[PDB]
């Protein structure tokens, strides 16, 4: 919905010009290419016309034309960028690099004749000389180390495990020793009712005492090993390392063999039902599957490159007070030594001209970027291939994990 949409039906030439100043270092970047909004495809080449670049190229990708995003028909009344054309829009951004400096960018995106032009003024401040940015310690890509659904599922299963652990602990301490607990459980089916809390296996799995003191602090109610195991799997799940993956795998195998043991006790030698126990067993199995999947991805991701997601979602909300939009998102740059450098993106866009612009509902853009080099280019340069597609708004429930209300919580 606009005249502005008309202008992106074919292939559009793109020109990008950037003047920058990071910690006093001035530099210029000129890129040229073409965009195809029907495929959401960007093909561009950038060169640093002032010698070597003082910042890593991946730190400038977001700075260096969302009007080429592919908006599905259903969402075409939420495309602010195209509706502002040909007059264009001003795009301002603050990008905070954690424990490091900050980018302030102001850009104009507008049509000049046939060419979509993006002129950018950038200034970086308070950057560490030996940081990941000024030290050029960032990998030359924009990949996602672990798939997004695995991170979401991991934090969800770990959280639910911690909650069930805390609740089982609460029942062991403040419920399991009361006689009314025994009398009420013998007549009612409750999630708090289980015969293992006040039992031999309630502390330290039954074993691990008579391997140790039976009064020693190493013998503990199983809910303690619960909070510990699930919080441990959560905090180490944040780190993507071969070491971390091996540790998580081992601990998950321990959790599944312990779950099989206490399950055998639950069905045969202590004949009852425990919903908390069974649920935690299922959570152990899920963590086991996620860790195994993380190892398999760690070994075969190089084969599965051709089918990786590597998509970053930029989250867009309307800004009626300024007749424009706001956007927020976080880019995780991978550091050479295995660490991660976070980049917080605060963004606002306002139309340049006085025309009807589309104020969208909250949605996001899924952006994939591929960075490469030109062997014929002797200057400091970057070849960029982008795929951007708008998402976050449907009617059906079959794809509800794709909705904006659920994706914003995991970023």
From Swiss-Prot:
Effect noted on mutating residue 340 to A: In mut2.1; shifts fluorescence lifetime from 3.03 to 2.50 ns
Outcome of mutating residue 65 to N: In R10-3; matures to the red-emitting state with excitation and emission maxima at 555 and 585 nm, respectively
UniProt keywords, alphabetically: Chromophore, Luminescence, Photoprotein
Phenotype upon changing residue 367 to H/W/F: Results in significantly red-shifted excitation and emission maxima
Variant or mutagenesis effect after changing residue 66 to L: In RSGFP4; increases fluorescence and shifts the major exitation peak to 489-490 nm
GO term, biological process aspect, one: bioluminescence
UniProt entry tagged with the keyword Acyltransferase: no
Effect upon mutating residue 312 to D: In Cerulean; leads to improved quantum yield, a higher extinction coefficient and is 2.5-fold brighter than ECFP
Pfam families per the UniProt record, alphabetical: GFP
Known outcome of mutating residue 339 to G: In GFPA; leads to enhanced fluorescence at 37 degrees Celsius. In Venus; leads to yellow fluorescence, improved maturation and reduced environmental sensitivity
Uses, biotech or industry: Green fluorescent protein has been engineered to produce a vast number of variously colored mutants, fusion proteins, and biosensors. Further generation of mutants led to more stable proteins (at 37 degrees Celsius for example) with brighter fluorescence and longer fluorescence lifetimes.
Post-translational modification: Contains a chromophore consisting of modified amino acid residues. Maturation of the chromophore requires nothing other than molecular oxygen.
Phenotype for residue 65 to L: In EYFP; leads to yellow fluorescence, folds faster and more efficiently at 37 degrees Celsius and has superior solubility and brightness
Outcome when changing residue 310 to I: In ECFP; leads to cyan fluorescence, folds faster and more efficiently at 37 degrees Celsius and has superior solubility and brightness
Tissue specificity as recorded in UniProt: Photocytes.
Result, substituting residue 100 to E: In mut1.27; shifts fluorescence lifetime from 3.03 to 2.85 ns
Keyword hit for Metal-binding: no
Result, substituting residue 388 to R: In Azurite; shifts the excitation and emission spectra to shorter wavelengths and increases quantum yields compared to BFP
Subunit field text: Monomer.
Primary role: Energy-transfer acceptor. Its role is to transduce the blue chemiluminescence of the protein aequorin into green fluorescent light by energy transfer. Fluoresces in vivo upon receiving energy from the Ca(2+)-activated photoprotein aequorin.
Protein name: Green fluorescent protein
The encoding gene: GFP
């Amino acid at each position: 919905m606009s005249k502005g949409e008309e202008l992106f039906t074919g292939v559009v030439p793109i020109l990008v010009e950037l003047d920058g100043d990071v910690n006093g270092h001035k530099f210029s970047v000129r890129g040229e290419g073409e965009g195809d909004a029907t495929n959401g495809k960007l093909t561009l080449k950038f060169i640093c016309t002032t010698g070597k670049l003082p910042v890593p190229w991946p730190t400038l990708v977001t700075t260096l034309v969302q009007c080429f995003s592919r908006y599905p028909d259903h969402m075409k009344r939420h495309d602010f960028f195209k509706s502002a054309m040909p007059e264009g829009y001003v795009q301002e951004r603050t990008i905070s690099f954690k424990d490091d400096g900050t980018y302030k960018t102001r850009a104009e995106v507008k049509f000049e004749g046939d060419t979509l032009v993006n002129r950018i003024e950038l200034k970086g401040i308070d950057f560490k000389e030996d940081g990941n940015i000024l030290g050029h310690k960032l990998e030359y890509n924009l990949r996602v180390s672990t798939p997004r659904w695995e991170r979401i599922a991991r934090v969800l299963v770990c959280l639910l495990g911690i909650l069930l652990s805390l609740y089982a602990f609460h029942v062991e301490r403040e419920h399991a020793r009361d006689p009314s607990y025994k009398a009420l459980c013998d007549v009612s089916s409750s999630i708090s009712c289980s015969k293992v809390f006040g039992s031999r296996w309630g502390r330290g799995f039954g074993l691990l005492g008579s391997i140790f003191g039976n009064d020693s602090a190493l013998n503990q109610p199983n809910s303690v090993y619960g909070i510990v195991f699930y919080a441990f799997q959560l905090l180490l799940g944040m780190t993507v390392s071969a070491m971390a993956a091996l540790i998580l795998m081992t601990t998950s195998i321990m959790s599944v063999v312990g779950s099989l043991y206490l399950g055998y006790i639950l069905y045969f030698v202590l004949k009852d039902l425990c919903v908390i126990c069974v649920t935690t067993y299922a959570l152990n199995f899920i963590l086991f599957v996620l860790n195994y999947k993380r190892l398999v991805y760690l070994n075969e991701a190089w084969k599965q490159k051709l089918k990786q997601d590597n998509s970053h979602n930029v989250y867009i909300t309307a800004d009626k007070q300024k007749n424009g939009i706001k956007a927020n998102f976080k880019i995780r740059h991978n550091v050479e030594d295995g660490s991660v450098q976070l980049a917080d993106h605060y963004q606002q866009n306002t139309p340049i001209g006085d025309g009807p612009v589309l104020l969208p509902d909250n949605h996001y853009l899924s952006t994939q970027s591929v960075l490469s080099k030109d062997p014929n280019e002797k200057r400091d340069h970057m070849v960029l291939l982008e795929f951007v597609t708008a998402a976050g708004i449907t009617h059906g429930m079959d794809e509800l994990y794709k909705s904006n209300s659920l994706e914003v919580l995991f970023q």
